[PDB]
Amino acid sequence: METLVYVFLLAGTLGVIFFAVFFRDPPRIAK
């Protein structure tokens, strides 16, 4: 049952990484 928690936490970290890479705030130059 702890394998459920470990897997969920690792998958959540991977999901945060995915969303940070692909749904980042796009860099743009100010004016």
Binding site: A20, V21, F22, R24, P27, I29
Partner: protein, 175 residues
């Protein structure tokens, strides 16, 4: 200091301490930040001269950035997915990582002062006690710690007058 490192490992199992883990994370991440920042800045420099050796093409008092933040951002964004876009954030991060590592590891050593040590995982100790075929690298580390303690105590703590015969010293087959 090397003897202190191995003593603390053998008697406290300080590698298993999560605060030590956070500290070594801070140290290695700070070295990583130093290396990547140096390489990135030296490799996105603007062409401010006609000499192949580009160190002389910088003036201390210039009010112009000597390297391209935009090009570095593009490089690291399309290589690594994310990249710094703000110099001030970058340089505060370079500060925060090693400092946070040192303070975290300080918490762990303060814990070790009172023998409040993340020595063992009780679940695996009980399972290995009841299951003599259950082996993990954690258990091998515990055996190594026992070896360190028993084979080090006699000469490392001479005031205790530890006389451990060869019978009681924890050993392995052959060596």
């Amino acid at each position: 200091i090397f003897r202190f490192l191995l003593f603390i490992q053998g008697f406290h199992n300080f590698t298993l301490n999560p605060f030590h883990m956070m500290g070594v994370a801070g140290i290695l991440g700070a070295a990583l930040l130093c290396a990547i920042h140096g390489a990135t800045v030296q490799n996105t420099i603007f062409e401010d001269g006609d000499a192949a050796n580009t160190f002389r093409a910088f003036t201390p008092t210039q009010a112009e950035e000597t390297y391209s933040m935009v090009t570095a951002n593009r490089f690291w964004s399309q290589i690594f997915g994310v990249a710094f876009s703000n110099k001030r954030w970058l340089h505060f991060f370079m500060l925060f990582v090693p400092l946070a590592g040192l303070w975290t590891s300080a918490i762990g050593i303060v814990g070790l002062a009172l023998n409040l040590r993340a020595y063992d995982f009780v679940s695996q100790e009980l399972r290995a006690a009841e299951d003599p075929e259950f082996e993990t690298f954690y258990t091998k580390n515990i055996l190594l710690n026992e070896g360190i303690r028993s084979w080090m105590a006699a000469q490392d703590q001479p005031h205790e007058n530890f006389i451990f015969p060869e019978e009681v010293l924890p050993r392995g087959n052959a060596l």
